[PDB]
Each structure stands twice: as structure tokens, then as C-alpha cells.
Design a protein. Structure first.
Lengths: 323, 407
């Protein structure tokens, strides 16, 4: 009945329906550490929650009490556990509970317990019909919310709702092409449907990716995605790629383009290829430009790559010491 | 020469490291531009005010903040009422990094308090009478080990701890966070951290666990919370660190992981982000940057000849610069970024990060970089447990004298 933020809110120790129960004070010990000076409202609710929990009172009034305990601290997993016990024991309408969790997630979307609670409900009801649309709304206010994407993946995987997700991905990439969560969702959808071995699909993706790089050269997400889908089979396996990236050298240069070229040469030198020394020099040169000019923040990484490539791909590498 | 600026973030060239949005504006570029502007003001604040830049870690200010919070917290920490052992750990570890003695009066109170948090069924709760959970169990154990006394060690009920870990183990190798709770890679690391320290690892406890963690590595090189999810620093640390513990680091593509972590250091701010295309945050000074000592030790185990013998594979200077200039609260405690308010979580991991960027350790090779005044130097920390390296050795040695529960 009575809300926590209500002007006529009364403490539980001043409530009649609650006079039979003695509250249980927190057992903090003789002299406590990290002791929190709780407010009046907080301690009152939790003193009464400690009581119903202690007595394992599975009552309607206790169910209403968990709502307040949660509102005071949504991160209290014990209270969420007891509330789920209550949901089953009291045979509560779970669609009502879904309406409740929808509300709570809206206000505290970055909380672990609230998302797991929703999962459990969907699991109990075997009903995903509200899920994609609810998640989309959270993603409308924070498009990168980790728990929201995680829930969306779980729902889509369990209930096989793959049909429309790629389209959803395209809309959000439209809206913000720098959204790395959406580039991850794209890899999630594709690799669980068609996969990346279908040469037509791998074709469509790379054209799309280079196209986005053309538009936003300095967007790291597109570069990482391009690397992510081609490196499995080996980058040197795609000889046209190296040249087409060198086409954007003057007009669409970036520290990420230079890094990619190093990765292509890197795989080239692993799969013995043409000019197994001219390609090395090209790479060490670009490594030094990165470590000293274009990407100095990673100087320790870029001087490591050069020292790894010289450690195995110099002309003197497999040549014995006495020679 | 005398025109030369000793601080990497103040150098003229550094100005070219600002974001290039390519005239295409999105929510990501706008938000990153805002932080960059806020960080710029902090950097060129010395030129404007016409003063000589000096980098001081406010040791005494932080100490007072910590000394107090260890005893009493305002109602602002009501949202952490289910994370009280974390509060112990964050504070105790922060004190340890600043090198402050822990009075045996405090040590015994922390002990007694954590004992009240410990479940009869094993593990620790977020506070007295709360159900056991793997996050505060990791926090409790870590805290008790920092204290390192016989009293502290004996608090832990090893039989029940192991029973508890088992009751959370899933068929696919993962663990629940608590009974009826969620699953992600944090549980793996928490389970592994406490099990290895207290010497309770049975042959089958982590069966399939390393493979499940390996499934968490994605196309980015990094590790996500569960298989299929975006790579994230905190999860990546948990996974890698868990794998180092199980001695299964090699299950991962360490090459792509290294590329991913080193790309998480911001070219302008010098601090780290949690994931690609998001904002810098001082607490990632540990989760992200702390991966490099792990990767360094893993690659060295393979016999990687190219590894540096003096530096970690990130800009150690620039990370220290970011923390000291941008993450310090004048009143004490540390923070996410300028504009944010201090908390004990960011105090813990900014200083853990700073310690990491200050100390290099690879067997017999030991090199330091202590930016600003030399009193900024902190105690080193173990890259796996994030407690003092001496406390890790001290604790493992103690618990190895105990048999693994069940002979
Ligand atoms: C031992 C242990 C418990 C480790 C976990 C460490 C850790 C940092 C986990 C990250 C949790 C999370 C969902 C962050 C995303 O929040 P956000 O989107 O508000 O932050 P972000 O934008 O920097 O990803
Ligand atoms: Zn943070």
C-alpha cells in the first residue's frame, strides 16, 4: 500500500499490523568497523526485514516489506532472494512482478540484482514477448548499458529470436557508428546465424566496414571489427586488403590504419611469402613511426612488436651463430 | 635543455593527441570531447596560473580519509550495506599501499566483524546475517590476508568455504555468484582467488572452468562477462587472473588480448577506459593496466625473448600523470575523473594502479618509475590478488601447512 517516498510514510515500528513482531537489530559486534550510520528509515526497514527473514515469515506483509528494503538498497541480494522465495510461496502473479521489475530497472539500470531478477521471471513464465522491446527502451537512454546487452543476448539465444536483431543493430549503428556495444552485437548475431564462412556474408561485412571507415577513419570500433572477422583465417589470406588499405594512406590516414598494416605484414611473415625481408623493413619502419610519432602512448607495445618481428623474421633469424 | 617539459601530458606535441571526430558527431564523440576538454584544463592549469608543475600524492589527506572510513561511514554508503567486506578490503589495501600500520586493535575488530559476516554454510556475506556471496567472500579473504595474523587466518572456515564453492559450481565450468544468483566471469576469479590462497583446490573443483573462461574471450581480443559479450577490463582482469591461478593462461589468445588491453590506454588522458570507445576511469588504472604484469609473466613463461626488462607494456609515465593530476581529491581519497566524487572503491584501485605503474618486477630484474616527488612511491601489489606480494606468500605458506579439506 504505502510508498517509501510518500509524504505520509510511517516507520514500521509505528505501524500497527507490525506490533506483534519484534525488530532484529543488526549484529555489528562490541566494536564495529566500516559501520554505516544508517538513516531512521533505513534501519527501521532492515530491522524489520531481519525479523521476517529470521522467522522465515512467508507472509503478504513481508512481501510488501521487501519492496521497501529493495528501494532502500537494490544491491541487497539477500532481500532479492527472500522476495523470490515469497513470490513462489505466496503464489504471486508474475506479470505483476514483471511490471514491478520493469519499473525498478528503469531507475537503477546498472544494478546486477535487478537484471537477474527479470531473467528469473522470464525463465519462470517462459515468456520473452516483452523482452526485446523493454531492453530497447533502456538502450534508448543508455545505448551501451552492459547488463542490458547481456540480457538481450541471453534472451535472443534462449528463445531463438534472431530474425530482427541485425536490423536493430543497423539502426543503432546508424544512430551512433562509434557504439562498440552494437559492433559486438553485430558479431553476435551474424556468427550465431549465417556465420562468417559464407563468402557472400564475409564479403558484405567487409565492404560495409571499409565503407564506415571511409566515412569515419578515426573510429576505432570499425577497425577492430574488420580485424576481428578476418584474423581467424589469417590476414595474408586476403591479398587485396593490404593494397586497398594503402589506398587510404594519404586521404584517410589514422594511427589505426598503420597498425593494421603491421598486422597484415605480421601474418605475411608467418606464412612465408614474397620478399621475406622487404616486408619486414616495411613493418619495422611503421612500428617506429608509431612508437615515436603517431601512437606514442603505446610506445612500449610498438617497440615490442618490432623486437618480436626481428626475433624471428630477420634474414639472420634461422641462420646459425657460426655462419 | 631548459625548454624541455619533463611531464608527458604537458608537452606541446601532446596537443595533437586530441580526439579527431572527422566532423562526424555522435554521442560517443561528444562525450569523449567533453572529458578531453575537462582533462585539458587540468593539464594547462599550471601555465595559466604561472606556477611550476609538481606532482604530489596527498598521502596524509588520503590516510585521514581511510583511517576514518575504516571505522565509520555516512548514510551515503547505504548502497554498499551489502558490500561491507569490500569496504574492509578497499580501505585496508589502500592503507597497505600507502604503507600505514594496521593497529592490532583494528586488526582484531576487522577479524571479529568478518567472522559475523561468515555464513554457517561457508563463505562470507555482505554483512552480518546476509547470505554468502562470492564477491564479499573474495573481499573478506583478501582483507584477512592483508592483516595476516594467526587470528585473521583462523577466521576462515576452510571446510565450509570449499563446500560453498562446490554448491555454486556449474556443469559448464562456471560458478554462480551466490545461491540463486547470476553467472559471469567474476565468480571464476573470486572462487580461484580464495581457493588458491587457502589451499582448498581439489583436482575437480575447476574442471572445465578454464575452458569456460576461454569462451569469454571475443573477437576484440579481450574478455567479456559471459560468452558473446563485449570485452571489458574488469572481466578481462578476472579471467586472465583466474587463468594465471589455474596455470591455464595459454588457453587464451594472449596475442590478441595484449593488443586489446594496450589499446585501452587513452592517447590524450593517459588513463585507461573499460572498453573500446568509452570514457577514461581511474579505477581501470588497475583492471586494465594490471593485466600487463599478468601478460608479462605469461609470455615470459612461454620464453618470449622480446619482453622488456625494465618496463610494463603501457605508458607508465602517462598513467601516473593521469592519476596524480586528475584523480586526486584535495580533501583526500581518489576518483574516477575530474568532476566525480571520491569513494573508497576508486581510492583502492587508483592507488593499486599507481603502484603497478611505479613498480616493475620480473625475477631478478627490478626497475621503478616514480613520477613527481619521490615520496609518491607506494608499496608494490600482487597483480593477481591485488594485495601485498608479501601477504600472498605469507598466506599461501601458512595454509599449505593445512591439508586440502578431505585429506
Ligand atoms: C573482482 C571483481 C568484482 C571485478 C569486476 C570489476 C569490474 C570493473 C567489473 C565491471 C562491471 C560493469 C558491468 C561495468 C560497466 O559499467 P559502466 O558502463 O557504468 O562502466 P564503463 O562505461 O567504464 O564499461
Ligand atoms: Zn571506475
Amino acid at each position: 500500500f504505502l510508498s517509501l517516498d510518500s509524504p505520509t510514510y510511517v516507520l514500521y515500528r509505528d505501524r500497527a499490523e507490525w506490533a506483534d513482531i519484534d525488530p532484529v537489530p543488526q549484529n555489528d559486534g562490541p566494536s564495529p568497523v566500516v559501520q554505516i550510520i544508517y538513516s531512521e528509515k533505513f534501519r527501521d526497514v532492515y530491522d524489520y526485514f531481519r525479523a521476517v527473514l529470521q522467522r522465515d515469515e512467508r507472509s503478504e506483509r513481508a512481501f510488501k516489506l521487501t519492496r521497501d528494503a529493495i528501494e532502500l538498497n537494490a544491491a541487497n541480494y539477500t532481500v532479492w532472494h527472500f522476495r523470490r522465495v515469497l513470490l513462489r510461496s505466496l503464489q504471486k502473479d508474475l506479470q505483476e512482478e514483471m511490471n514491478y521489475i520493469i519499473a525498478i530497472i528503469e531507475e537503477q539500470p546498472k544494478n546486477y540484482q535487478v537484471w537477474h531478477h527479470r531473467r528469473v521471471l522470464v525463465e519462470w513464465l517462459k515468456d520473452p514477448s516483452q523482452e526485446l522491446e523493454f531492453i530497447a527502451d533502456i538502450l534508448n537512454q543508455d545505448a551501451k548499458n552492459y547488463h542490458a546487452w547481456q540480457h538481450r543476448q541471453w534472451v535472443i539465444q534462449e528463445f531463438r529470436l534472431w530474425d530482427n536483431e541485425l536490423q536493430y543493430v543497423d539502426q543503432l549503428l546508424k544512430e551512433d557508428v562509434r557504439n562498440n556495444s552494437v559492433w559486438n552485437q553485430r558479431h553476435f548475431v551474424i556468427s550465431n546465424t549465417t556465420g562468417y564462412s559464407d563468402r557472400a556474408v564475409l564479403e558484405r561485412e567487409v565492404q560495409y566496414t571499409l565503407e564506415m571507415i571511409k566515412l569515419v577513419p578515426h573510429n576505432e570500433s570499425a577497425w577492430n571489427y574488420l580485424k576481428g572477422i578476418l584474423q581467424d583465417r589469417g590476414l595474408s589470406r586476403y591479398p587485396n586488403l593490404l593494397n586497398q588499405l594503402l589506398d587510404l594512406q594519404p586521404s584517410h590516414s589514422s594511427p589505426y590504419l598503420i597498425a593494421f598494416l603491421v598486422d597484415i605484414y605480421e601474418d605475411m611473415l608467418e606464412n612465408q611469402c614474397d620478399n621475406k625481408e622487404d616486408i619486414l623493413n616495411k613493418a619495422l619502419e611503421l612500428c617506429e613511426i608509431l612508437a615515436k610519432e603517431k601512437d606514442t602512448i603505446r610506445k612500449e607495445y610498438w617497440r615490442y612488436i618490432g623486437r618480436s618481428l626481428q626475433s624471428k623474421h630477420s634474414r639472420e633469424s634461422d641462420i646459425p651463430a657460426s655462419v | 635543455p631548459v625548454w624541455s617539459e619533463p611531464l608527458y601530458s604537458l608537452r606541446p606535441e601532446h596537443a595533437r593527441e586530441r580526439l579527431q571526430d572527422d566532423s562526424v558527431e555522435t554521442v560517443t564523440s561528444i562525450e569523449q570531447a567533453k572529458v578531453e576538454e575537462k582533462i585539458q584544463e587540468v593539464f594547462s592549469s599550471y601555465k595559466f596560473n604561472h606556477l611550476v608543475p609538481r606532482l604530489v600524492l596527498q598521502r596524509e589527506k588520503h590516510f585521514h580519509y581511510l583511517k576514518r572510513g575504516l571505522r565509520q561511514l555516512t548514510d551515503a554508503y547505504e548502497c554498499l550495506d551489502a558490500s561491507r567486506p569490500w569496504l574492509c578490503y578497499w580501505i585496508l589495501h589502500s592503507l597497505e599501499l600507502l604503507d600505514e600500520p594496521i593497529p592490532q586493535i583494528v586488526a582484531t575488530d576487522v577479524c571479529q566483524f568478518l567472522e559475523l559476516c561468515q555464513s554457517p554454510d561457508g563463505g562470507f556475506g555482505g554483512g552480518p546475517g546476509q547470505y554468502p556471496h562470492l564477491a564479499p567472500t573474495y573481499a573478506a579473504v583478501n582483507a584477512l590476508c592483508i592483516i595476516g595474523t594467526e587470528e585473521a587466518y583462523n577466521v576462515i572456515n576452510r571446510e565450509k568455504l570449499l563446500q560453498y564453492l562446490y554448491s555454486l559450481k556449474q556443469p559448464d565450468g562456471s560458478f554462480l555468484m551466490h545461491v540463486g544468483g547470476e553467472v559471469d566471469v567474476r565468480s571464476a576469479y573470486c572462487a580461484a582467488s580464495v581457493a588458491s590462497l587457502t589451499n582448498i583446490i581439489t583436482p575437480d573443483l575447476f574442471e572445465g572452468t578454464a575452458e569456460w573462461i576461454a569462451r569469454c574471450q571475443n573477437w576484440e581480443g579481450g574478455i567479456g562477462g559471459v560468452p558473446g559479450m563485449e570485452a571489458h577490463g574488469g572481466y578481462t582482469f578476472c579471467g586472465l587472473a583466474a587463468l594465471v591461478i589455474l596455470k591455464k593462461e595459454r588457453s587464451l589468445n594472449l596475442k590478441s588480448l595484449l593488443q586489446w588491453v594496450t589499446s585501452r590506454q587513452m592517447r590524450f588522458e593517459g588513463g585507461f577506459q573499460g572498453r573500446c570507445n568509452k570514457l577514461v576511469d581511474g579505477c581501470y588504472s588497475f583492471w586494465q593496466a594490471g593485466l600487463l604484469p599478468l601478460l608479462h609473466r605469461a609470455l615470459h613463461a612461454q620464453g618470449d625473448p622480446a619482453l622488456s626488462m625494465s618496463h610494463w607494456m603501457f605508458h607508465q609515465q602517462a598513467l601516473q600523470e593521469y592519476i596524480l593530476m586528475c584523480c586526486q581529491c584535495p580533501a583526500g581519497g581518489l576518483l574516477d575523473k575530474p568532476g566525480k566524487s571520491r569513494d573508497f572503491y576508486h581510492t583502492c584501485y587508483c592507488l593499486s594502479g599507481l603502484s603497478i605503474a611505479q613498480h616493475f618486477g620480473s625475477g631478478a630484474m627490478l626497475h621503478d618509475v616514480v613520477m613527481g616527488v619521490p615520496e609518491n612511491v607506494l608499496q608494490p601489489t600482487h597483480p593477481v590478488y591485488n594485495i601485498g606480494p608479501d601477504k600472498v606468500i605469507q598466506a599461501t605458506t601458512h595454509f599449505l601447512q593445512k591439508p586440502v579439506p578431505g585429506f
